[PDB]
Design a protein around this ligand. Sequence first.
Ligand SMILES: [Cl-]
Ligand SMILES: [Cl-]
Lengths: 144, 144, 144, 144
Amino acid sequence: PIQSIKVDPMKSGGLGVVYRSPDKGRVSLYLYNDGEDILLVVDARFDWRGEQNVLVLNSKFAGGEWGPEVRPEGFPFPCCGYVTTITVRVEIGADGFTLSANGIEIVKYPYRDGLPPPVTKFQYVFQDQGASETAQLESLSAYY
Amino acid sequence: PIQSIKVDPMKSGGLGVVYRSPDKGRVSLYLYNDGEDILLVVDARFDWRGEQNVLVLNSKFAGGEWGPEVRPEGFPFPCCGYVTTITVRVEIGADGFTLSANGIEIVKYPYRDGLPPPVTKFQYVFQDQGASETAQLESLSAYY
Amino acid sequence: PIQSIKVDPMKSGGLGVVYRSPDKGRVSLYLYNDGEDILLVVDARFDWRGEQNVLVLNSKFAGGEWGPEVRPEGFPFPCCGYVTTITVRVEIGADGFTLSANGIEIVKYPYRDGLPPPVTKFQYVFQDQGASETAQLESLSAYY
Amino acid sequence: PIQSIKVDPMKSGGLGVVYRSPDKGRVSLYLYNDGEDILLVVDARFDWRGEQNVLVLNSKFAGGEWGPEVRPEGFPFPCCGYVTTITVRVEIGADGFTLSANGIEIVKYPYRDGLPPPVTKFQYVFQDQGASETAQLESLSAYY
Ligand SMILES: [Cl-]
Ligand SMILES: [Cl-]
């Protein structure tokens, strides 16, 4: 449920993960810096603390709390309570992260008010919430 | 919208399509033989004539009637109006077909009485409802 | 050893094969039309009739003569007797074909005078010399 | 020419890299532990300090020098002075690392005399030796 990869000062390219999704709970992806700030989170919520099939993007500093939430239409959660393999890739952009899933671009996310790269840790977290089918991680990836 | 490949008689192997899904309408996969009998159709109904996110399997002779329709679950229909990229593979068994989507098995279809392989056609058909994102086909593939 | 797919008239798109190579012999890719003219053959000679690791492109009418033979370089022929997995794709241009192996372009073949697309057959043929590892074909693929 | 990924205590699974090979020089892959020992190196030598198209596997402790060298037949170096995309995956086995390339297994390598996992850093190094076509890294990967 927790694993991660730790990379050389990544000021370009993209990280990516492949996982089997879960019917409940959520699957978050963390993009830390050296200060251990959160340059970005990608929180896909399958069935979480009240909401289904919701995608959240945010960023905080280590010590302070969260910023304005981003919910973008386009994340391929399955309907019907199903589960499938999802590919998510995060591109390290010039003016921001660019997120896509299963090869289809979800959204551009400009770097938060003084929180630019490099990314140095990339982290997958699954948090269960009573899931009949738990998430399964297949792969973590840095691209150059 | 309508595309196919003609193989050499396959009795062993598998077939694969890759496409971006539509928000409405349906996407059908026809496995024919010589006589243009449907050994199996895989009808992914995203929104079609009053069904949402419905997987239909079945078979009919060339100019015959449909058999009883199998309705499996586990098909990565995106929630909430979305479109994603789908990967679908059918393994041509010695028993029946084995259906998969995104590296995940959905169901076993024992061939219908009188409709064994050889398969010689693999067909893609998309049929529009009122979809704002029509499906676009990517790849058609035989596996040996 | 010998396998193919029949497409709908492709004038736009690409075709793909994936195979494990042999140590000796050759592997040819034929792009036919209706009249069974060779719009293009891609003849990878691993050891064939006194050529080692030789890439031959060419075209002939159905019951006609070969044209002048193009001999490109850059084809991932394994060294030292080895077998590997090859990925070959041909893009059906508006100019000619674009040849690729393992995500890498090898050459541009402007269609031969009188042999434009539509392509309707994509054929794989392996011909043994004295190879201790015969080639085994994996996938045949049209791209749209 | 140098990049690497740093992983959670990997006692199973496999690491992998995708690169564009170089016409000369060599491309080494390092599997370190926490002591910064070398659990394994995978040195593919395209054109190195006297030899062509040679594959070397070894392991040392941090302070002492190398062990017995392993050269396994099967690495897909290109002939002819060419370059192509190579996929190498290293599986973290029960009794050893298991190496394959382009989906074809090269060899089992049992853990060196008291040098078992976990792996914690995975590292790509290209060292040039007058190369007309330098290696290009595409991706580093941990598999679970
Ligand atoms: Cl027909
Ligand atoms: Cl014919």
